Each structure stands twice: as C-alpha cells, then as structure tokens.
Design a protein around this ligand. Structure first.
Ligand SMILES: O=C(O)C1=C(c2ccc3ncsc3c2)CCC1
Length: 164
C-alpha cells in the first residue's frame, strides 16, 4: 500500500510527504506520533495528527493520562488510530529544547520493533531540537521492522537523502 518511497536499507524507507495525508491514504495498521510525556498534542506532528482526528486523539489521551500517569522519555503507549490508522503508537523522543538526554533517542526508536510495519515521522527532530541527520542514523541502526518515514519539509528530505 505504501508508494513512492526511496529505499534506504533492507527495512527503512523514506518519502517527502505529510504524515497526516499519508495516513489518510494508506490507513496503516500503525501510525507513530511524536508525543510528549503528558500526551499534550499541541504542535508539530502531534498537533497535526490530533487536528486531523477532530480532537478525538486528545480526548482519548487525557483519559489515558488520568488512569496511568505520564509516559517516560524514551517510552510509548498504543492507543486508537481513529480515522487515520488502526492504532497510534505514541512515542516520546527526548526534547533537546527542554534539556533532555539525546541518548534516550535509541530507547524511543526501540518501541518500533514491537510492530511489523509502521508509518512514522523522524523522532526528536523539528521542534524537539535534535539533529535530524542523527535521528535518521539512530532509526536505521535501531529499528529492525519495516518503517516508512514521511518527511514533510522538502528541504530537510533533500538534505537527509544527500547526506545518508
Ligand atoms: O518535516 C518533518 O518531517 C518533521 C516534522 C513534522 C512536523 C509537522 C508536521 N505536520 C504535518 S507532517 C509534519 C512533520 C517533525 C520532525 C520532522
């Protein structure tokens, strides 16, 4: 069902695309959200995915936090994918702009290995403040399952491919 991707490795693929539009087209089994520990989906990929669900992702996430408390940096939880996917895997990469340890990025990507195939964004990139080239390197070196990476920014996509 995924089309137009560049193969980087045996199991990692990449495309210049909006992950929201990709999820609406493919209806993947799992879409990854670039979450924070409170599951407050205000901006970046999380704000865009939540708006595409008409805020249903945020209402579900608030009930999850009321029952379970916050996630760990490097951790994840599986919730509904609403109108975008069967499931959403909310994964917390470290936010460098909040002073979090970049070494937790490998632990964040290890959550992907629990799912045979995923549609995902680059973790800890964008407003999370990490170097996207480093994030793609950790993804390739950690994830063993089939990951389809959707990169929204065209200039970033071109830089990630040409420096890989
Ligand atoms: O350019 C990108 O691929 C990146 C992100 C992003 C942010 C917001 C957004 N809204 C719709 S698709 C999307 C992707 C976060 C990390 C890198």
């Amino acid at each position: 069902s995924f089309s137009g991707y560049l193969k980087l490795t045996d199991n990692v693929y990449i495309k210049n695309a909006d992950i929201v539009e990709e999820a609406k087209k493919v209806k993947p089994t799992v879409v990854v959200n670039a979450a924070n520990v409170y599951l407050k989906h205000g901006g970046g990929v999380a704000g865009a995915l939540n708006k595409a669900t008409n805020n249903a992702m945020q209402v579900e996430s608030d009930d999850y936090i009321a029952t379970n408390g916050p996630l760990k940096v490097g951790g994840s939880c599986v919730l509904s994918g609403h109108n975008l996917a069967k499931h959403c895997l909310h994964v917390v990469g470290p936010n460098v702009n909040k002073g979090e340890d970049i070494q937790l990025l490998k632990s964040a990507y290890e959550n992907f290995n629990q799912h045979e195939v995923l549609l995902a964004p680059l973790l800890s990139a964008g407003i999370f403040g990490a170097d996207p080239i480093h994030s793609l390197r950790v993804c390739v070196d950690t994830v063993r399952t089939n990951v389809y990476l959707a990169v929204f920014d065209k200039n970033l996509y071109d830089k990630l491919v040409s420096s890989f």
